[PDB]
């Protein structure tokens, strides 16, 4: 159906969400580290992102996407491992980009944890 698409690699310290959409912003498939059998400490690992991108990428590979540009966001560890999965799955990358929300000293952050 669609050949050009976008890969979103929204990755946090706890979980990484890898949804891949079209050029417009309509989601086609999505996978998560916590929805792949990994929970707790193993969910926040780069490998759990490697399988999440592998599952999501293969899920919409049937759609017809071959050209896709990733949009990584977040400080998580699966921001680097997930992109490697798409490259090894047969995807032809268009551009690697990092659109992370950086406030210009806006809303106040939560208080520092005393751990």
């Amino acid at each position: 159906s669609v050949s050009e698409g976008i890969a979103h690699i929204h990755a946090s310290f706890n979980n990484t969400i890898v949804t891949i959409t079209d050029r417009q912003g309509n989601a086609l498939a999505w996978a998560t580290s916590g929805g792949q059998g990994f929970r707790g400490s193993r969910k926040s690992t780069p490998f759990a992102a490697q399988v999440a991108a592998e599952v999501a990428g293969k899920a919409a590979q049937e759609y017809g996407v071959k050209n896709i540009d990733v949009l990584v966001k977040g400080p998580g560890p699966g921001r680097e491992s997930a992109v490697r999965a798409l490259g090894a799955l047969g995807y032809k990358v268009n551009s690697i980009s990092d659109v992370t929300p950086i406030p210009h000293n806006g809303c106040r952050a939560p208080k520092k944890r005393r751990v």
Partner: protein, 153 residues
């Protein structure tokens, strides 16, 4: 230890086959410093399977079963700031043979055959095709190695 790497000892090969692999396996069956008692157990077990499977040379057969038991990935215990990560790592070759030789003897000691030479013969035959506690133990280690497959530290 803590500083050096002491050199490993030299082991004389078995008198009936001239192989250091069987002689090392005799060491794994022996208890109470009774070399001869373990030798007839190993020789009897090897003769039983050799006489049953019609194989002239059983040293190569023991290699086949040993390679079918040796694990390739083991799950080590690691600590990172109080957190325990059960990292799966490779097994050094000297430890591969030791683990396989250990599991065979310990799995054969809980069999139901009449004699220990017969008990060991059953496990060697069973592990040859890929069954028995020895194979089950190797899968259990590999199952735990695949269970994590996420700590590469």
């Amino acid at each position: 230890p803590r500083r050096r790497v002491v050199a490993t000892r030299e082991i004389l090969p078995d008198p009936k086959f001239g192989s250091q692999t069987i002689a090392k396996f005799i060491n794994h069956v022996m208890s109470h410093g009774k070399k001869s008692t373990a030798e007839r157990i190993v020789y009897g077990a090897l003769e039983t399977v050799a006489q049953k499977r019609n194989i002239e040379d059983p040293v190569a057969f023991f290699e086949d079963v040993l390679e079918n038991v040796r694990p390739m990935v083991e799950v080590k215990a690691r600590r990172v700031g109080g957190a325990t990560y059960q990292v799966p790592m490779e097994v050094r070759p000297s430890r591969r043979t030791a683990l396989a030789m250990r599991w065979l003897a310990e799995a054969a000691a809980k069999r139901s055959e009449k004699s220990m030479a017969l008990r060991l013969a059953g496990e060697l035959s069973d592990a040859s095709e890929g069954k028995g506690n020895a194979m089950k133990k190797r899968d259990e280690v590999h199952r735990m190695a695949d269970a994590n497959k996420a700590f590469s530290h």
